[PDB]
Structures are given as C-alpha cells and as structure tokens.
Design a binder for this molecule. Structure first.
Ligand code: NI
Ligand code: NI
Ligand SMILES: [Zn+2]
Ligand SMILES: [Zn+2]
Ligand SMILES: [Zn+2]
Ligand SMILES: [Zn+2]
Lengths: 262, 265
C-alpha cells in the first residue's frame, strides 16, 4: 500500500552534518525516506562518502565526481579524483555532482567557462565507460549543460535543482532527462513555474541537504523530501501517494543500479 | 488530493513575529489546507483573532488559558482565567474550540497539591465554558495523562483533542474509548514515547499537529506548520498504508472533532 521516498540528490558528507549525521539519518528512516543518493563535490570527501555507503549499506547510495565550483573547477582537480572513482566504479550509483555553473562571481572568464566545460565532458565520457548515470548541476547554465549532455550522448541524466526557464527544461524532458525538485520550491517562484510545466513522468525528489531547504540560511535535512512531494501533489491536483509512487519509480529508471542496491 | 490540517499550533508565538506571513504563504504551497491556532494567555487573544481575520478560513482561532503561565514559568491561577472570560465571550461565535487548556503536572510547575487543584479548577471551568458555547477543547496533558482523561470524562466532555499526548498507550486507550482524538507532532521521528503511542493508536482517532514553534523534527530548532507532512509520513510507514490514506482520514477526523471546521473553510 505505502511507498517510500527517494532523495535523489544530497550532501551527507557536508561539514554541516559532521555533528549529528547518524541522528539525522535514523530520523530520515522514521520520516518514510527509503533511500538517500549522496553526491560528492571534491575528491577530499570521496572516502567519507564511501564510508557512509558502507555504514548505511542499502540506504545511503554513493555518487563520486568533481563539481564545477571548488573558485571555478580545473582539470588538475579532476586528475586527483579519477584514480579514486576507478577504485570504487562498481560500488557507485552515479557520477556524483558534475556540471556547469555560469554564475558571474565563479565563471566570468571565457577560459573558466571552457575549463568547466572540459571537466564535465571528461566525466560524461567516464560515466558512459563505467555505464553510470550523471547527477548534474547547471546553475545559470541550463542550455549550455543540456546541449553538452546531448552532444556527448548522455543516456541517464538527473538535472538537479534546475535553476532555469521551463522552455529550456522542455529540451531536457524530450532528451529523456530527469529533474529533481528540492523543498526550496515552496519559497522559489522560478522552481514553481518549472514544476507547473514539467510532466510527473520526468520528476524526481531531492533536498540538496544541507542546502535548498524550506527556509533560507537554515539547515536542510533529507526528511524535507515530503515537502517537495506535497508541493508537487497540490500543484498537479493529485494524491501525494501518486507523487511518491511515480517519483520513486522514476528514480529506479534514472538509476538502474538502485533496485538491486536498495 | 484532500489537504493537511494542523490541529494544534501557536502562530501568535513571539518566534513567528518576524516572518509569520512568509511562513503561512510557504505552508499553503506545502499543501496545508488549515491551521488551528491556539492561545496560552489572554494577552495574545487579540493577536490570534486579528490573524484569523487576516487569514480568514485558513487560520482557525482557539482561545483559552494554558496550565503554565509567564515568559520564569508558574502554574495557572483562577485570576488568570477571570481576565480571559470577557474576551472569549466577545469572540464565542468566531472560535473553532477552547484554545489550549489542560493540566501540566511537571515537578517544577505543579509540585504542590494546591497548584494541582488550581490547574484542575481552571480546566473544569473551561470545560463548563466550552459546553455552554458548544465548542470542543484543545487539550494539554504533560505528566498528567490519566488525571486529564479522568477529569474530562467526569465533566462529560464530548469533543476533545489530546494534543502531543506524552503518556503511555494504556492511558491513551482510555481516551480512544471515551471518543477523544490525539494529534501527532513531527517530533515523533525523534521521540520513542510517541512512537509506541501511534503503534497502538487507531487511525480513526489520529489527527495531525506541529505545535509550532515547538515539537519539531529537531530539538531547540524552530518548528513550522509545513512539518505536518513529516507526521503524516511517519504514521503511513508505521501503519503500512498510503500517505494519502493518512491525509484523508486525519482531515476527516479533524472535521468530526471540530464541527465548525467544514463551515469555517
Ligand atoms: Ni535543522
Ligand atoms: Ni525554521
Ligand atoms: Zn548543485
Ligand atoms: Zn548538490
Ligand atoms: Zn501543550
Ligand atoms: Zn500547544
């Protein structure tokens, strides 16, 4: 009868959870959260993610990769990360937060934009070789990211917390890409216009814990995945159980290793 | 869909003074169809009533005097209820229930037998007031589960909500047989006591609450009415049923417990 909730994108290894991660994780189980997809940002926390993956086996699923922001990412940042990913290739659910961030502060220079582009292209190629999906960031770079993903022939893709127009998002739905919705949708008008247009067959749930919570500058936790489910249910004029059943089914399609690893 | 009801919360609390409208707009987006705002002291009755006018049909007001007073805490007095009575009488027709009444037999506040009887008398009068105005009671029962449930039975209370019942399931079963309702706050995911409670508790007797700003998923972290889905999620998993079944039944139970609700929405 009852179905579980999947957090397709979160940062459990973040310094914000160092103090109470186990209490947070036990409470998430009680809050009907069946699986957590833990993503990486830098190579320095890959061991910590793989350690959480072993301690909470079948509940915390790992993702390793180098994020566009580190300062903009460099090829040198990806070089350090490649031997570690290769060592855990069989244990990963996806390539853990890769993408582009064309924010004025981080990437203003054309060289910085190409460095990001190069680091993403290699990780799309790495993912294709290891037969793994990509868990993607695209802040202020929605069309650049989607085009690059199409060009590189990415099959299983998650566009997490899509900070872009619905016309750009429609390019992704046609490309067969998935979109995760964080609980910050209840305070964000941009995320509101997005879900409106987005078909439920292409929607997944995320928190992006410790970020993108219901309140700005207040720590976000994986149990807030129900807030996302509630917002989508009301906006789509359907049952919350329908949202929970379809988004969890979408998570199983997007991440093919999930059904077995759960 | 059906919508979620927060059967017990403190929107008038000083914790919400800065961003209440942002909190309430955010709660609407989070599929919260109704909020039942309760009182603690007469000094915030005007604030609760003004809020219910501003958010008409969404914020449902409850007025009453809580067993604990002050903000160093002390036990309630008959004088505290006397100041309240003229204000409740002025808003009798606009209220959904008598707003957080009950007993608190914590060692710090009601140690003395006289303090325990002062609380008992303040509650008894409010049950009498509620019976006259034909209103339900929204009840507190910290460390006084059986004393509250017996007193309510003795006084012949018809529509009762035992909010965040902190007592044993055997004591709670006395309430279900008496036809009383029990609201569950999102602190259930961190509280073992409330975990054994819902286990035994029939869903036909369960309601949802947050008790905002208190009893959140995290201790010493502000609780907001959108956390009512966390409560619904916990109950669904434990009962091995659909979250929509919990949302539909608890809202239906809220409409039975509060007879003015269907009309006031
Ligand atoms: Ni927190
Ligand atoms: Ni807060
Ligand atoms: Zn991101
Ligand atoms: Zn992220
Ligand atoms: Zn209380
Ligand atoms: Zn209360």
């Amino acid at each position: 009868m009852g179905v579980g909730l999947v957090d397709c994108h979160c940062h459990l290894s973040a310094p914000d959870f160092d103090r109470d991660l186990d209490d947070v994780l036990e409470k998430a189980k009680k809050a009907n959260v069946v699986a957590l997809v833990a993503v990486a940002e830098h190579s320095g926390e890959f061991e910590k993610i793989m350690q959480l993956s072993e301690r909470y086996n079948g509940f915390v699923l790992p993702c390793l990769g180098v994020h566009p922001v580190q300062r903009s990412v460099t090829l040198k940042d990806l070089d350090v990360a490649l031997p570690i990913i290769e060592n855990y290739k069989d244990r990963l659910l996806a390539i853990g937060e890769v993408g582009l961030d064309f924010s004025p502060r981080f990437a203003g220079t054309g060289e910085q934009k190409e460095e990001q582009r190069q680091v993403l292209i290699r990780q799309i190629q790495l993912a294709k070789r290891l037969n793994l999906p990509v868990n993607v960031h695209s802040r202020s770079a929605g069309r650049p990211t989607i085009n690059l993903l199409q060009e590189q022939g990415a099959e299983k893709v998650l566009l997490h917390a899509f900070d872009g127009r619905p016309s750009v998002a429609m390019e992704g739905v046609r490309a067969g890409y998935f979109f995760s919705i964080p609980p910050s949708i209840i305070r964000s008008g941009q995320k509101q216009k997005l879900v409106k247009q987005l078909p439920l067959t292409s929607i997944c749930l995320e928190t992006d814990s410790p970020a993108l919570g219901p309140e700005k500058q207040v720590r976000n936790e994986p149990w807030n995945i129900s807030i996302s489910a509630e917002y989508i249910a009301q906006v789509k004029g359907i049952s919350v159980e329908e949202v929970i059943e379809v988004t969890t089914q979408n998570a199983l399609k997007l991440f093919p290793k999930l059904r077995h690893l759960l």
